[PDB]
Amino acid sequence: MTLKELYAETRSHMQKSLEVLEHNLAGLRTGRANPALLLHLKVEYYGAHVPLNQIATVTAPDPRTLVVQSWDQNALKAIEKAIRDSDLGLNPSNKGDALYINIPPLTEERRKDLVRAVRQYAEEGRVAIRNIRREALDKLKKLAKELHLSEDETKRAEAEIQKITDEFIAKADQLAEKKEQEILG
Numbered sequence: 001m002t003l004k005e006l007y008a009e010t011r012s013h014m015q016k017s018l019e020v021l022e023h024n025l026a027g028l029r030t031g032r033a034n035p036a037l038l039l040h041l042k043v044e045y046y047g048a049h050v051p052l053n054q055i056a057t058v059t060a061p062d063p064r065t066l067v068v069q070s071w072d073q074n075a076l077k078a079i080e081k082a083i084r085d086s087d088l089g090l091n092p093s094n095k096g097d098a099l100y101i102n103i104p105p106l107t108e109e110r111r112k113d114l115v116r117a118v119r120q121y122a123e124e125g126r127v128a129i130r131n132i133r134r135e136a137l138d139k140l141k142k143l144a145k146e147l148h149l150s151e152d153e154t155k156r157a158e159a160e161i162q163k164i165t166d167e168f169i170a171k172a173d174q175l176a177e178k179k180e181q182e183i184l185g
Contacts, residue, residue, distance in 0.1 A: 003157050006143065010136040010161060014129050014168040021125040021172055028114055029088065030182035032103040033063040043082045045075055052079060063185075068092070068099040106183075114183045122176035126169055133165040 026036055035058040042049040052058070056070040056079055068083070070076030080092045080099055087110075092099040106114070140161065144154040 001143070003140075003143065003160075006136060006139055006157070007160055007164065010132060010164050013132045013135075014164065017125060017128040017132065018168055018172060018175070020128070021121060021175060024121040024124075025118065025175060025179045028117055028179065028183070029106065029110065030114075030179060031063065031185040032106065033060050033066070033185075034182070035060045035066060037088070038066070038068065038083060041079075041082055043075065043079050045078060052082075055079065064103055066090075066101040066103055068101065069097055070099070071097075073097075111183065115180055118176055118179050118183065122172060125172040125176070129165060129168050129172060133161055136161045 026034075027040075029037065038058050039051065039053050041052040043052050043055055045055055052068075055072065055075045056068050058066060058068045060066055068076070068079060070079055076094075076097075076099060080094065083090055083092050083099070083101065090101050090103070092101045137158065140154065140157050143149075144157070149157070
């Protein structure tokens with residue numbers, strides 16, 4: 001529990017929050033040209049719920065299409081019977097070792113539901129990050145008094161915490177803003 005460990009810990013927590021944010025975003029139907037959209041899809045295979053990637057591959061040739069390659073011809077069948085079963089509203093077609101799935105332009109209804117969701121997640125990210133700064137500063141207050149650090153030493157430590165905070169805020173914004181541009185595409 002030293003200044004150095006305080007920093008490491010602060011950077012660690014913020015990093016975890018940034019990941020929770022990435023997750024919340026990747027779980028959104030962008031311009032939908034994303035292949036990761038279908039990665040988490042648990043597909044029923046041999047009575048088990050195996051994620052699609054371990055059972056198939058999905059690449060995004062052009063920004064309007066999505067292809068799903070399945071090594072197993074049978075798995076490909078059930079992958080299609082799973083791609084749907086969601087708000088995704090996709091229509092895969094059976095052709096060869098892969099399913100062809102066109103991504104239709106999204107309705108300005110779910111487009112609302114998407115840009116709003118992104119911004120909601122973004123602020124949730126910042127709130128978490130500012131709260132982490134808050135906890136780090138509280139710990140710095142006790143640590144400084146406890147270790148009798150100089151005004152310059154403690155103010156320097158505050159500056160270090162402040163610097164870590166702004167990097168993740170900046171990075172959080174960049175993530176959100178990028179997903180926003182994908183959705184408004």
